[PDB]
Design a protein around this ligand. Sequence first.
Ligand SMILES: Nc1ncnc2c1ncn2[C@H]1C[C@H](O)[C@@H](COP(=O)(O)NP(=O)(O)OP(=O)(O)O)O1
Ligand SMILES: [Mg+2]
Ligand SMILES: [Mg+2]
Length: 429
Amino acid sequence: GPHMATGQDRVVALVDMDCFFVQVEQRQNPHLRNKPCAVVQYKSWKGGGIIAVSYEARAFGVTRSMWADDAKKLCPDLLLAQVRESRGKANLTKYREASVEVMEIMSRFAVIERAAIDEAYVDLTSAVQERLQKLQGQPISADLLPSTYIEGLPQGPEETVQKEGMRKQGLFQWLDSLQIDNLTSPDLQLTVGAVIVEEMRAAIERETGFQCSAGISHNKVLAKLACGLNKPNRQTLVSHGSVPQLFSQMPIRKIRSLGGKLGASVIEILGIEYMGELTQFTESQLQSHFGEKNGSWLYAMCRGIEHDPVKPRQLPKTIGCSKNFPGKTALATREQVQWWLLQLAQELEERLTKDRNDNDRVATQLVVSIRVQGDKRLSSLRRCCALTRYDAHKMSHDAFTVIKNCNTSTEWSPPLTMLFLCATKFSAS
DNA sequence: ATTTTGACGCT
DNA sequence: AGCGTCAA
Ligand SMILES: Nc1ncnc2c1ncn2[C@H]1C[C@H](O)[C@@H](COP(=O)(O)NP(=O)(O)OP(=O)(O)O)O1
Ligand SMILES: [Mg+2]
Ligand SMILES: [Mg+2]
């Protein structure tokens, strides 16, 4: 009753760029704008692998991971932009730099947690408190929320036939119901959060040209889920009260962290399909099947409650470079292995030197990882060494030294299907 | 031959 | 420390 926490203490947003790498390339090349477009890496093997797809191309069925030759079978007029290749490998610098543009804009509004190259969480609790104080009892106009959806609305009792009509009808129902007079109202706090996110998204688009979607809720899992509900170029508010109906038909795998083996086990062991069905288990039952940590997390999450903080971290914690060597291209000679370690180490050196100048820090550990032909696991072996000098020849030599005894017997066997260098354990400089 | 990353958990 | 999970 009066003591049941409801996980309504925070306002959290997740901002995710729409078809991000495609938009970077469309900004650079106006010929690609408003077209079915994709970004591809490599070209010789089946036209290259698609890693990003414009919404116009998705309408034809083009997806991430498709070979470009096959995408062309679905979408003959598909336009393609190629990832830069340097030193024999795909080089993602352009997208990392565009990411920095967006992150630097978002951080003007609030503390952000960089969650991936194109998305960040925002803890808006303090900003909402401030805006509620400058704005005192003044109602919030629908004009302040021109691209916001209220999940679950409209409900109940003809513009309803088109999607913008429905959006406005749901928003009107929501705002009509709001009580602006209580500064402690969670629903009001979320609404002010959404106003701020509209401002943030407008700033991102104005200052970079890039469009994005966003979720606004009380925690990161719900913000992330909300964000995906009305992509692209829209934002979605998931209130605490919307959770029971939303979760009643939500496949377990759609919640972040449950998309893999753990989610599959939740489905298989409990014989359920949707997140809401989890409410019928005690915390102890869930802990018994999935462990203390997972059990408690699931017990709270299925009720819309999660406490994971927005971490104050705008910069990546590691800087890595990897290359796969599939099928017949697997590395089978000592010289091959050393040459590719050098290529990787040279890209890594460039990125580390820039990072040291920009961010006043230095990496102190080098992690070397390899995969052997036949092993399905991403990494077959991982070994570390000291990272004491930003020198590509030294880093590549040290990596060879730490992995050379994996070679069973001038020849390398079994052939290597992946090399990976990662700089870790940063200290201030 | 789904590539190139990145964060965090378990022991 | 080294491996495993999940993710974009
Ligand atoms: N498996 C993968 N491998 C390589 N790059 C990937 C990737 N998944 C994503 N990327 C890269 C390429 C992507 O552009 C970028 C962001 O990933 P998203 O946010 O998952 N997808 P996007 O922004 O394209 O579309 P929208 O969000 O509107 O659905 O990260
Ligand atoms: Mg995105
Ligand atoms: Mg994303």
